[PDB]
Amino acid sequence: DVPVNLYRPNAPFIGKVISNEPLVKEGGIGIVQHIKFDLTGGNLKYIEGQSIGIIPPGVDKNGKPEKLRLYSIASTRHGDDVDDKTISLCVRQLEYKHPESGETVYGVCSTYLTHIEPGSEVKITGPVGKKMLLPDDPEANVIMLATGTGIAPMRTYLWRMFKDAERAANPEYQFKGFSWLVFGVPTTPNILYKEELEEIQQKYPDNFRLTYAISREQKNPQGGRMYIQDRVAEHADQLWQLIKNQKTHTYICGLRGMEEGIDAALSAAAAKEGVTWSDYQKDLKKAGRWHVETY
Ligand SMILES: Cc1cc2nc3c(=O)[nH]c(=O)nc-3n(C[C@H](O)[C@H](O)[C@H](O)COP(=O)(O)OP(=O)(O)OC[C@H]3O[C@@H](n4cnc5c(N)ncnc54)[C@H](O)[C@@H]3O)c2cc1C
Incomplete structure (x- = not known):
């Protein structure tokens, strides 16, 4: 009865970003964004307490394609607009220190998500x-x-x-x-x-x-x-x-x-x-x- 793996990484749902709103106010540490995705066109259904994968674009340092990252679903089964049409995430931009080669290192999938524009398509897997x-x-x-x-x-x-x-x-x-x-x-x-x-x-x-x-x-x-x-x-x-x-x-x-x-x-x-x-x-x-x- 619990929906699971309606979409898998070999054939993920291509959703579309509706919105990307900031959650951290002026004077705060870091970047956390509320991102809402359009689920119409497919059949991703989910309940409360589940996660989904997002596969970011590009390759890693070894030249291999990037893998999915899991994010806790931030919306109810009905979505933020209670229309059963969308899904939301709460994504913090990972950034860290010099002794990991460079100076400030930015996480692949988190930077991608926190800077992604309304209208962009995303590879989504799950729920899990x-x-x-x-x-x-x-x-x-x-x-x-x-x-x-x-x-x-x-x-x-x-x-x-x-x-x-x-x-x-x-x-x-x-x-x-x-x-x-x-x-x-x-x-x-x-x-x-x-x-x-x-x-x-x-x-x-x-x-x-x-x-x-x-x-x-x-x-x-x-x-x-x-x-x-x-x-x-x-x-x-x-x-x-x-x-x-x-x-x-x-x-x-x-x-x-x-x-x-x-x-x-x-x-x-x-x-x-x-x-x-x-x-x-x-x-x-x-x-x-x-x-x-x-x-
Ligand atoms: C079930 C689950 C739910 C999650 N839910 C959420 C959520 O709701 N919101 C959210 O923002 N994240 C969530 N996360 C974490 C998220 O999946 C990604 O791990 C995170 O966003 C970073 O991915 P990235 O692609 O940005 O980073 P990568 O580019 O993979 O960078 C991460 C790698 O760099 C290293 N690293 C990370 N931090 C440091 C540090 N301080 N010092 C040194 N090295 C470091 C490690 O090698 C780590 O594997 C969740 C994870 C799981 C497993």
């Missing part, structure tokens, strides 16, 4: 992934630990839950559980979808809690810069008591390196009640209630 699916249970609790572009699966959950046009389009999914997003970025202009995240929390103050960890603007109790792991440490007992509910799911998305600090905090929380988190977490993983996708 069953690790990050949203439960159909409206009474489910959904904890969302995200940094940077790991917001993208979170945005698909939240939009389906809380957007007026989504509610009207999903008679069966009228969310009434609780959801809690801890979102980690370096500055306030780097809060992707800040306006819409905060508006969702205004409409649904009892069903959505939004928590930020902004490193360049906030210190943890030890005097260091604030990260997502610090906010989880700070709310560890609440987060543990939510996790004990049979209906509670937890999603972790973003660049790799966050999972350790999150675990040590929940380890100290669980231990208070004579539970070793790492084994309890094994059972949550088998139960399909502990979702992680870092990269």
Whole structure:
């Protein structure tokens, strides 16, 4: 029932860019763009929590054709316009240091995508992934630990839950559980979808809690810069008591390196009640209630 690999890299869907909008505001670090693709002409269908491949043009340094790169789908199954005609991505331009031969190195597929113009055609494959699916249970609790572009699966959950046009389009999914997003970025202009995240929390103050960890603007109790792991440490007992509910799911998305600090905090929380988190977490993983996708 879950759509997967409707398109494969030997014969990918040639979609077309509708829009390419900036998500990082003035005064922020880096470039993250919201890119929306036209899916008409084909049959790419997808749900929340899945990814797609994009194959960038050109060859590598060895002269071989470039391979696909996976990106978390940033839209619900219906697309941003709730017309079931498009798909959106949340793409950050990878750029890095001198000791990788040169000076600043720019990632192939990410630079391509963040600079791509409306009207351009793109090789799209997928969808893929069953690790990050949203439960159909409206009474489910959904904890969302995200940094940077790991917001993208979170945005698909939240939009389906809380957007007026989504509610009207999903008679069966009228969310009434609780959801809690801890979102980690370096500055306030780097809060992707800040306006819409905060508006969702205004409409649904009892069903959505939004928590930020902004490193360049906030210190943890030890005097260091604030990260997502610090906010989880700070709310560890609440987060543990939510996790004990049979209906509670937890999603972790973003660049790799966050999972350790999150675990040590929940380890100290669980231990208070004579539970070793790492084994309890094994059972949550088998139960399909502990979702992680870092990269
Ligand atoms: C399931 C999944 C979902 C993803 N979702 C998203 C998403 O929603 N948004 C998004 O922006 N990205 C996402 N990514 C990452 C994305 O797929 C690409 O890896 C990323 O965009 C960079 O690709 P590129 O083509 O720009 O870089 P490449 O040109 O392949 O450059 C990457 C390579 O350069 C090196 N490198 C990278 N960073 C550094 C560094 N700091 N120092 C030294 N060397 C380095 C490594 O060898 C790495 O393999 C996702 C990845 C996966 C696996």
